[PDB]
Amino acid sequence: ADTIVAVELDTYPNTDIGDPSYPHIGIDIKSVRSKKTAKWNMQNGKVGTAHIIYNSVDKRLSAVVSYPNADSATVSYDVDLDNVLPEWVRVGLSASTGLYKETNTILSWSFTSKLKSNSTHETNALHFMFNQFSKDQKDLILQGDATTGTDGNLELTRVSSNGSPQGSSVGRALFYAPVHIWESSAVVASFEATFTFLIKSPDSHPADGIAFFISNIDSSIPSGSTGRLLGLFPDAN
């Protein structure tokens, strides 16, 4: 049903569904089994930053994840998103926990989309930036366990009062307005997304991860997508 293109920051190695044996960042085109992955030296309790970029001329989705004072992890995949997504999509962040858990806190999120047409100066653009989230963020569609305002952050999965992450949680937050990613007279379409996150677990094996995703506008959390499916896919195919 949903068409999902996602960049996952997967904290738990589910080697049985194709994950590598370490935290990794991957590019998922309609399947949790990433088309490409790169080792990610995930840092528990540290604030990281993910940058995702794409443009219709190169047709390459690339992502860079970094932590202050550390070397970055980057992954890229050649894919023509016009062939995968609808021309109107919603963008969001998703995260889950399963038997293992972690906080999936988002501290800021910005996104810029641009469609440059062939008429001179005909640029259509959408840009949003959230460096703080209020309890009543009317421009975000929160699905599942996702909540805003707790310390001005967006908590994608359930965290109990004493800051503790809860297992079997799944939450997503999508920007309210549809995003136009293809248009017939557009000569170049591009987007850039950036978000900082804080993944913290009391456990030595945090799970499951955070994913920036683009989907059909009506996307909703698939039943049973807690844990390894990142609140994005119905199954592991």
Next chain:
Amino acid sequence: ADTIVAVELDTYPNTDIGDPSYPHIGIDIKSVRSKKTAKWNMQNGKVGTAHIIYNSVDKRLSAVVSYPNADSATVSYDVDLDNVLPEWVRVGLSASTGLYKETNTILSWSFTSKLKSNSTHETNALHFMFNQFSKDQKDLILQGDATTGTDGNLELTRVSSNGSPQGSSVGRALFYAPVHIWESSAVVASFEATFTFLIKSPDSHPADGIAFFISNIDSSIPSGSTGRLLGLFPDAN
């Protein structure tokens, strides 16, 4: 019911509801009877540009309207919008015709809103720019007779096949996402809107005008607001 703050480009002098005897630009705070107006040397058939700016430190809503090769018209009004509007609003463009008519074509529209909080670097922003409108613009809520895609323009009021404007028409287009204009820890909130329009009438007395407005998110066209009420107000009080 609706709370409306609007900058009107009024093409027809309804001297009986307080308009001056000439085309004028005015600032309307909850009433069609503008709190302030300025003479506008409206140019039939020429593309104009309106710029509207406001920031919560100065609490002054200002608008400048110009035509290429001509002198601008500007109007400003001191008003604290925190005291008039809700903290979440929708922004839009509205226009109408009555017994007299004109095309109320919008060729481009950009808007930028910013809320700078007191935490270091905590900026929340929303920016959209439309330099072309497609027939299925999913990020715009079109109300009344407003349509998009005709020559990539947004036609706020009805235009028949042979380019002719129709009387008694009213249409509005609002950006889909709510806009956050006040937040408790914001030290400065500001917005800037710009739109180019083309008002053309076969008649010597075009009517009724175009208005950039900000309203409660659920605003809808008031019954009977064609003509002098600009699709914004229920009556002329």
Next chain:
Amino acid sequence: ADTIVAVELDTYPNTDIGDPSYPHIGIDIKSVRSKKTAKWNMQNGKVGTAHIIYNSVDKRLSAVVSYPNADSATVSYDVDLDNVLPEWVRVGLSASTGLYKETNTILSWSFTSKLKSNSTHETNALHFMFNQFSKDQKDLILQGDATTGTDGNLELTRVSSNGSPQGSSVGRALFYAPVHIWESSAVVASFEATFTFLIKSPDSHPADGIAFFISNIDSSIPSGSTGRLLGLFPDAN
């Protein structure tokens, strides 16, 4: 010689040249004796943020200074900068120490200038943002004791190896490119500047302050402007 318009964050009350008896923020139009001031509850050792805005329609220069978890200080002054500055100016940050001292560290600085002409879509813009400063920042003109790269920050006045601020220091940093602030067919000109700073003194009476300023392009530090003159004015008239 130099034409200076500056927003000062004055940490030391020189009541003899008109300062009030407390830290204050003020708007200086060609004189160190501010045209308007507001009490500033300056916080030693804390990172603050200053926002400065202005547009040619309202002709009001306004500034807001804040510290996380604290109430802001704001000051505004009605002034038509077209009547004070040249149409091409350089923008910068200046700071000084005298007998009393403090570190005048700048951690980030962004500036946006826009000139919207009367031709449809004719916007001229300049935007720079520095969230990190490198030792060889070729796009900044550093004058006096100002240095960059120390912890990626810009140190406007001299700081010795052990982090200690030195007295009788004065330094300014200007963006390399001239900024066009007036143009004959411009219907609205506006600018916005933001910078975060960290003023820290071992002493109970820090001095002298930091100032965001706009000047003729060839401005240089006036002789003897350490201390109370903020590296901006030749004398206290």
Next chain:
Amino acid sequence: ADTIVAVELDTYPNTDIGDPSYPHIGIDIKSVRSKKTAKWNMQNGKVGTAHIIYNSVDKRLSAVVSYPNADSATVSYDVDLDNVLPEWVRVGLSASTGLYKETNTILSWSFTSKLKSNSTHETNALHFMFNQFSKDQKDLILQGDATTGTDGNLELTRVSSNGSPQGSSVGRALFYAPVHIWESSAVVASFEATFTFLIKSPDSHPADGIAFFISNIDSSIPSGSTGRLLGLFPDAN
């Protein structure tokens, strides 16, 4: 001496130095003999738009050129600019005429550069946009025959009073401030340039072309680079 990376809009086929037999767009890395070209259906007397993009993660320089109501031409080349250019560069536009000629008019030019560091939220950016050029554009370095203000346009090569293009002309315009394109803790560096141009010749064989280029900051026009060398290269090697 100069390090030049340029995207050329070559109007004249100098098949002897490797041009194809038609107008073409090409990517030049330190040589006029393009590393990659694409046929360009150049339209004499029509305003076109060129878009150039690049980011350090993909290391692909791509350009798209279009005319209203026509299909675009696009060319891309895989190149790591960190390995070719200095970390501080100047960006510009260059053009020339030789025995054959054409007007090389620039109507608008925007450029955005971004360097995202590994510290959370550490973005350094530079953005300029010129939609009009004044006779005294102090933020542009004009070299050779380039002049500004004629109809608010930038004329890269000599045009006589009666609008006629002159042969053997060469002119370049560079943005005044150095641009920082690489920095040691940057996880992603990217730029985007856009410019609209109007190439008009009374002749059936216009020459020579327009080029968007990036170079060492001190670049100057090489002697003898009129005609086929586009005011960029000293020779045709």
